[PDB]
Amino acid sequence: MKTAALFVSKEFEEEAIALVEGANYKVTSIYKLPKSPNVKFYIQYDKLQQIKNDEEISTLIIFEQLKPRHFINIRRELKGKEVLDKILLLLEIFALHAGSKEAKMQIELARLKYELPIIKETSTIKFYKRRINKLMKELESIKIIPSIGIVGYTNSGKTSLFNSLTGLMSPKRYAIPINNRKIMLVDTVGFIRGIPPQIVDAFFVTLSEAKYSDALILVIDSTFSENLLIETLQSSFEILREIGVSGKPILVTLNKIDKINGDLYKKLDLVEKLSKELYSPIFDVIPISALKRTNLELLRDKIYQLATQLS
Template sequence: MGRALLVVRRSDRVEAEELARVLYRELEVVELPDNYRASPSTYLTPKWVSEIRKILDSGSFSKVYVYDVLSPRHVSYLMKELKVSVEDRVMLILDVLAEHAGSKEAKIQIEMAKLRHQLPLIRDWVRRVKLGELPGFLGPGGYAIDTYYTHVRRRIAKLKRELERIRRVKDIERIRREERGFKHVAIAGYTNAGKTTLFNKLTGENRATGPELLTTTTTKAKMVPIGNSKTVFIDTIGFIRDIPPEIVEAFYATLKEISTASAVILMLDSSDSEEAFSMKLRESMRILVRIGYVGKPLIVALNKVDLVQEEYVRKLGELVERELRGGLWSYRIVPISALKGVNIDLLKKVLEEVLEPPTHLHGVSPAPR
């Protein structure tokens, strides 16, 4: 896909680079300090614009990603100054999701989210063309942009109708399963925590997995008996820090699978640093609250325990205890390795208990002796 330049604050660099490298093998990074204060009118100050322009002049770049939420004014200014396509954090995430999208539902969701995010920018272009600030932009000027704006609005309306139809079908399927006594267990968590690996291990499926972020773009459900319960496991899209509202809206049907589940397995990566682990735990909890999953069983799976020392896993378990104790969920904590199969039987036993109340006992489930 050519070559891209990424502009990102220091503390966001790891996540942003992982996302951008899904799309671009050749990537240049301009690192802003964490205390950088964006200009209200231009986002980047003249000093940073000049530095980025020098980098762009030294090579062939097809896109600049700014890993933040940009206003239409920011994008218009930066495109005018840098003479290259400029997109923000939301569009980068959507571009990565589009790279992995396979189902019709995922493609519709992503296209609609992109168009909705671009609509204010197109509206800004219309305004600027009429003011004479962007003469001849997009071909024959204002008429072309007005026409394109109308086309985008109609396209969004059409996609929304298609998506609502898909959602109704999913809702009916879920309700029918519930009426037949099926329990739904959503496997949720931060992107790249091992959700799909666990789904495959529990169901015998062979869904694609990989080190890239956001590889799952649509839900997959499969029924597996757990004790006396007919349990439908659901693999879901990965969480990401400060998940943008456009993505929450676009993936409403996917996230609803979590909010309506009988129980949630929250996957956390035990190989993360304590700081990253804590951030992802808190962000996951915020997202669960935001989508309405509260007051139900939560099984916290400390995944990838095969990569770290037992003492570190115990420390992470204590950290989870402190965050969840007296909170919004009845919870259990289970250390596992989805890839190596460590404690999968223990996880199934805990699932059997929480799906057949009364059970919701707090605490870390020890490994069987």
């Protein structure tokens, strides 16, 4: 699968890793951001030469926003190989999770707009503007078996939960048998922290596809402190309300419970009380560990029972 070299601060590293893997890349090396960025290449020239020539690295990913002159100079050196900055990386995540025409158009619109400052730093300008104006036109004119979508913040364990259920394309939709029922599991885009303003519409439109699913599984990191757990739940439900999720059963899975080292039953009871205060109908609230495979038979049985309720 595609291999990336990732440059990222330690502060963002864990989050960036989980973003790069949501864009279908394996992170094969990781470096801090440069202390004093190179004026032409951002990263150091010798590192750039190594990545240019390394057949096991398909892609350079820089978790920052690059200036145009950096794109121009990096893309030349890489001769073919792709560079993504933080904007282009999140637009890649969206492209891999979007199945609707409107989201595909917003993603392509955002990519085109991002390329304009690069071209201007390099006829081609007018060509891009005509495509951007056509998409904006059409967007404005759009304006006027059970499927279970998995939602939740980045790094809550959504891919691990999907993979666990499926035993494992884009968008990711995969049917599984449970007892005598066939259920469509759907990899919805995560709630992303810190979305750059340029891509907020592409994000929301892609995420709004979650309303196509008959029910949702909301995945919550149990290792979070009580106050952070509360905040994560309050934002998760605030986002779902605002994108127009209404009346869908939601199964909340409190995940990574192997890593708590703490009071699981108090977390679970907090989550369950707050979730039902914030939303109806909550199908249920269960603790699991998708990595350690704890309570996976419960998670299976609850998905079957939801699938039966829906049918």
